[PDB]
Design an enzyme around this catalytic site. Structure first.
Site, short mmCIF file in Angstrom:
data_model
loop_
_atom_site.label_atom_id
_atom_site.label_comp_id
_atom_site.label_asym_id
_atom_site.label_seq_id
_atom_site.Cartn_x
_atom_site.Cartn_y
_atom_site.Cartn_z
N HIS A 167 8.95 -59.46 -36.38
CA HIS A 167 8.18 -57.81 -35.54
C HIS A 167 7.33 -56.97 -35.50
O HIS A 167 6.97 -56.94 -35.10
CB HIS A 167 9.48 -57.08 -35.00
CG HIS A 167 10.77 -56.64 -36.76
ND1 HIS A 167 11.60 -56.77 -37.28
CD2 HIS A 167 9.54 -54.99 -37.08
CE1 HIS A 167 10.98 -55.44 -38.09
NE2 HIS A 167 10.88 -55.05 -37.87
N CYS B 130 11.78 -52.53 -43.80
CA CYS B 130 12.20 -54.24 -42.89
C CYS B 130 11.06 -55.31 -43.89
O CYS B 130 10.39 -54.48 -44.76
CB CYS B 130 11.66 -54.10 -41.55
SG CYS B 130 12.74 -53.20 -40.94
N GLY C 46 10.28 -48.46 -42.66
CA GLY C 46 9.28 -49.16 -43.05
C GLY C 46 10.25 -50.16 -44.51
O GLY C 46 8.95 -51.03 -45.31
#
Ligand SMILES: *[C@H](O)[C@H](C[C@@H]1CCNC1=O)NC(=O)[C@H](CC1CC1)NC(=O)[C@@H](NC(=O)OCc1ccccc1)C(C)(C)C
Ligand SMILES: *[C@H](O)[C@H](C[C@@H]1CCNC1=O)NC(=O)[C@H](CC1CC1)NC(=O)[C@@H](NC(=O)OCc1ccccc1)C(C)(C)C
Lengths: 306, 306
Positions: B41, B145, B143
Site C-alpha cells: 500500500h 507500517c 508511519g
C-alpha cells in the site's frame, strides 16, 4: 494505538558485549574504546564472595589472568585497575563498534532497558524501573553479571546500570558504570535486605494518561482534590509523595488529554480506595508504575533513535 | 530469578531497516541481500486506500518513483514486483549487514519480537503473541507500517510478521513476509472486524510453571482433573481447548517443577472459578497468556543468541 512495555533497540549495546573469564568465574564485560568494564567480583572464586577483600585480591592478579573474548577474537589485556565496584581491563584494541556514549546515574522512578547477556552473548532485552528502594525487578540467572542497563537519546547510549547480584526476594542490585552501587548494597554474599519499597506515584499517573490516550476512560470522574489531600491518600497506600515538579512534568500529558493533573489524582484516589472491580486498564488489573511521563510521550508520539 | 516480558536482541534486524518513500507515503522497508520488502500500500495515496486495485496501480509506477534510504545512503531501485500484499524492490546493492534468515509463518499462540520503526529508524522493541483471532496487540502509530516481527534461533532470524494496519479496537493486522495476511483481513480501509478472541490456555499453564519456578506457589492445590473435565471449564471461560500435544509440550516444565500437567490444570480451574482474591502471580493480577512453553524455558535456563 496500543501500549507496550517497550525497550530501546539493543544493537548499539550488543556490539559492546564481551566475555570475561578469570579463574573459574565467567561473566560479561562492556567494551568501549580500549577498556572493558566488568564487575570486580570476577576476581573472586565461590569461597571468596562470602567476605572478600578486593584490593588484596587484585594486586595478586596479572593481565594474562584475564581472558577476554569478543566473539571468537581474543582481546589482549595490557592493564587493569579497579574503580569502586567495577574493574577496568585495558585492552590493546579499541572497539570499532563503540557508539557515542555517556555514563549516567539514574534516579529511583526512572526506567531503562536491560540487555541480558550470558558468556558475552545477548539473550534478551526488557524494560524496567529503578525502584524507590534502589533494587530493580529484573530477570537474571547465573552468569548474567556484567549485563548493562541503558537509555538511548537519538544516537547516544547512556549506560546507567551494571548487574552484580540477586537479593533474597528475587530482586536485583547493581552499580552505575563508575562502580557505585545503587542503594545500600555491597558486592559481598552477606545477608542484605532490599528495604521497604513504595509505588512510583508520578509514573502511575503517566500510565493513566496513556490509558486515556488509548481510549480507556472508565476510571475518570467528576471529582477533584488538592495536592495535599491526594498525598494524604498517597501515604496511606504506600505511594511516593507527589510534588509540584511531578505535576509540572505531567503538564504536556495533561494538555494533550484535557484532564487536569489534580483531576487525574482524584481518579487515582478513587482507584486506590475502591479497586478496579474487575475492570482493566491497558490490559492490566493492577496500577502500573514502571512507565515515566517520558516513556508515555515517547511511545504515543513515536520518537526514534539511531 | 525474575520473569519479564523479554524480546530478542534487535541488532540483526536494525541493520536491515530502511525508509521507503513513494509519492506522499513514507513507511519502513526490510532490506535483505539486494531486495527491499515493504507493504504494497506504499503505492497508494490517502484516497487510494479506501478501495484500491494494486495491480493497476503498480504498472503505473516506475523504479525512480521509489525513494529508498538506508541511513543517509540512497539505494538505487532497479526492479520491482508484487508478491501478494508485499512489494519487492530490487536494488543494486546487497545489504552487507544481511543476517542469516528465513521467512516463516507462525501459528496463533506463538510469540515474537516486534522492532517498531518510523522513517526507517527503530523506535523500540517489544514482545507479543499472535492472538487466536490472528490479530496482535501491538503498539504502532502512523508511519510504522513495514516494521517486522521476528524470532532468533542462535544466529538465524526467522521473520514472521510485517505490519500493515490497525483495526477499530486498537489491535493490529499484518502479513507474513510472503505477503499473506494473518487472518481474514485485507489491505483496504474497509470496515473489518477482529473477530472473537480466546485465551491461549497452554501459554497460561506455561506462565503458571514460570511462577512456580520463581517461588509463587499459593495457587497450587491438592486437587486434580481430567483433560476432558478441564476442557469443559476451559470452554466456559473462553479458553482454547488443551490437547495432548499441549500436555506433551509442557512435559519438561512439569518435570522441572514436579507438578503434573493435569494438576496444574486443576489449579487453573480453581483460579478461573474463584479469581485471585487480591493475590498476584509474577507481578500480575491477571492470568497471562503471551508466554509460550519455550519462552518460559528460554528465560528460566538462559539460552542466548548471536
Ligand atoms: C553474577 O553472574 C551473579 C548473578 C546472580 C546469580 C543469580 N541471579 C543473579 O542475578 N551474581 C552473583 O553470583 C553474586 C556475586 C556476589 C556479589 C559478589 N551473588 C549473588 O547474587 C548472591 N546473592 C547474595 O549473596 O546476596 C544476598 C544474600 C546473601 C546471603 C544471605 C542473604 C542474602 C546469590 C545467592 C544470588 C548467588
Ligand atoms: C502504516 O504506517 C499505517 C499504520 C497504522 C496507522 C495507525 N496505526 C497503525 O498501525 N497503516 C495504515 O495507515 C493502514 C493502511 C491501509 C491498509 C492499507 N490503514 C489503517 O491502518 C487504517 N485502518 C483501517 O482502515 O482498517 C480498519 C477499519 C477501517 C474502516 C472502518 C472500520 C475499520 C487506519 C484507520 C488505522 C488508518
Amino acid at each position: 494505538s496500543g501500549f507496550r512495555k517497550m525497550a530501546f533497540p539493543s544493537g548499539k549495546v550488543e556490539g559492546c558485549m564481551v566475555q570475561v573469564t578469570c579463574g573459574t568465574t565467567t561473566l560479561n564485560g562492556l567494551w568501549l574504546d580500549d577498556v572493558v568494564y566488568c564487575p570486580r567480583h570476577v576476581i573472586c572464586t565461590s569461597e571468596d564472595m562470602l567476605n572478600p577483600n578486593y584490593e588484596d585480591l587484585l594486586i595478586r592478579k596479572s593481565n594474562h589472568n584475564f581472558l577476554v573474548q569478543a566473539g571468537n577474537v581474543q582481546l589482549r589485556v595490557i592493564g587493569h585497575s579497579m574503580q569502586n565496584c567495577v574493574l577496568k581491563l585495558k585492552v590493546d584494541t579499541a572497539n570499532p563498534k563503540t557508539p557515542k556514549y555517556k555514563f549516567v546515574r539514574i534516579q529511583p522512578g526512572q526506567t531503562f532497558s536491560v540487555l541480558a547477556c550470558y558468556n558475552g552473548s545477548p539473550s534478551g532485552v526488557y524494560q524496567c524501573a529503578m525502584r524507590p528502594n534502589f533494587t530493580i525487578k529484573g530477570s537474571f540467572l547465573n552468569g548474567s553479571c556484567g549485563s548493562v542497563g541503558f537509555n538511548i537519546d537519538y544516537d547516544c547510549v547512556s549506560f546507567c546500570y551494571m548487574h552484580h547480584m540477586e537479593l533474597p526476594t528475587g530482586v536485583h542490585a547493581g552499580t552505575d558504570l563508575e562502580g557505585n552501587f545503587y542503594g545500600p548494597f555491597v558486592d559481598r554474599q552477606t545477608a542484605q535486605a532490599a528495604g521497604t519499597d513504595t509505588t512510583i506515584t508520578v509514573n502511575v499517573l503517566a500510565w493513566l494518561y496513556a490509558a486515556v490516550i488509548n481510549g480507556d476512560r472508565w476510571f475518570l470522574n467528576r471529582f477533584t482534590t488538592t495536592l495535599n489531600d491526594f498525598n494524604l491518600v498517597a501515604m496511606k497506600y504506600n505511594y511516593e509523595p507527589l510534588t509540584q515538579d511531578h505535576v509540572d512534568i505531567l503538564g504536556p500529558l495533561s494538555a494533550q488529554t484535557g484532564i487536569a493533573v489534580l483531576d487525574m489524582c482524584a481518579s487515582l484516589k478513587e482507584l486506590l480506595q475502591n479497586g478496579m472491580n474487575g475492570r482493566t486498564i491497558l490490559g492490566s488489573a493492577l496500577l502500573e508504575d514502571e512507565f515515566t511521563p517520558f516513556d508515555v510521550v515517547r511511545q504515543c508520539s513515536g520518537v526514534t533513535f539511531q
